[PDB]
């Protein structure tokens, strides 16, 4: 299975350690809930600039 | 944040309950690791046909038909 | 430019005429805002099942109760 | 609803102002045509280098040098 | 590497054989130009209705 | 059609010339296999940081590239 996560960096995060936790956690979720093979799981994390992510018509930067 | 999950159905699954567990699981995960707001988390699950998902240069339909 | 739209169908929609209005709509916007050549604009629309869309930790299906 | 826009930056654009215009415009369109709840609309703008975008078999960058 | 292909079905196609040709062709190109590891390559093909794909302001369906 | 390629840069690559090959290569494949008109093919290449790509529960960076 493929998992794509797009998030807006906030207050000095995410760190490489938190990224690892996200990767391992979503991966284990597929195993425990769907009994999937862990080795074939691909996860990609995209960090979006605050000025390029909109929620409810406003940029997250504006909202911040 | 935004999370997109693409997977191949198998042995009758996934059910709506398992899908609900996946939605709840990934959300709680974002909260636990990044302390993000649960309310604004969007999750989309795409179910892909075994003949349209390729791993290593071969479709999953072929792989599943082995062992 | 490329534009991808993912939405959950609802109350019979969206119809083909509606999908056409979205295509023409986002296309003109690009010309107006960035003066892009309309000829090279590509738009893709994806429909997602209520049991497959989550918002706030619950499926859209459950939210619709 | 979720919207993802990918474009090649050109002649000093797009500006943060121009980006907001795109976010606002796209969101309004979704309300105008589908009567969707504006509060839950997510839009993401990706900016791509002229060398990483292809059209008709050539990079946007090469197309420009031809003119 | 991950490759996503999106196309509008036409004149009966694409068949599963053509899908396999795309899956392998894309994979081979990655190994050939960048010498990537073939086993870890993931490819996903999305088939899009002609009423959901637009070019130059019109849907592929109207294009006539 | 539309083709999106996501990869992790490795050992001084990919170069613009390589990206051109990838663009032309993917485009020719659509022409040959599906008989598409070249002019309408759009290809986008995304370069992903090794600490952001996960495989089998670990990151490409931890696996030491790919």
UniProtKB/Swiss-Prot annotation, chains B, D:
Q: Name one GO molecular function term.
A: isomerase activity
The UniProt entry's sequence similarity note says: Belongs to the 4-oxalocrotonate tautomerase family.
| Pfam families reported for this sequence | Tautomerase
SUPFAM superfamilies, from UniProt? Tautomerase/MIF (SSF55331)
The cross-references to PANTHER family, in alphabetical order and at most eight, read: 2-HYDROXYMUCONATE TAUTOMERASE, TAUTOMERASE-RELATED
Q: List the disulfide bonds in this chain.
A: none
E.C. number: 5.3.2.-
**Active-site feature positions:** 1
What is the name attached to this protein's record? Probable tautomerase HP_0924
What InterPro entries does UniProt report for this protein, alphabetically? Answer: 4-OT (IPR018191), 4-OT-like_dom (IPR004370), Tautomerase/MIF_sf (IPR014347)
For this UniProt record, give its keywords in alphabetical order, as a comma-separated list.
Isomerase
UniProtKB/Swiss-Prot annotation, chain F:
Q: Does the keyword Cytoplasm apply?
A: no
Q: Which residues form a coiled coil?
A: none
Q: What is its EC number?
A: 5.3.2.-
Recorded GO molecular functions are: isomerase activity
Q: Name the source's superkingdom.
A: Bacteria
Q: Name one Pfam family in it.
A: Tautomerase
Keyword list (alphabetical) reads: Isomerase
Q: Which InterPro entries match?
A: 4-OT, 4-OT-like_dom, Tautomerase/MIF_sf
Q: What class of enzyme is it?
A: isomerase
* Active site as annotated: 1
Q: Tell me the protein family, please.
A: Belongs to the 4-oxalocrotonate tautomerase family.
Output the PANTHER family linked to this UniProt entry.
2-HYDROXYMUCONATE TAUTOMERASE, TAUTOMERASE-RELATED
Q: What is this protein called?
A: Probable tautomerase HP_0924
């Amino acid at each position: 299975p493929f998992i794509n996560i797009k998030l807006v960096p906030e207050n000095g995060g995410p760190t490489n350690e938190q990224k690892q936790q996200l990767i391992e956690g979503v991966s284990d979720l597929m195993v425990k809930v769907l009994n999937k093979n862990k080795a074939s799981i691909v996860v990609i994390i995209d960090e979006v600039d605050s000025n390029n992510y909109g929620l409810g018509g406003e940029s997250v930067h504006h909202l911040r």
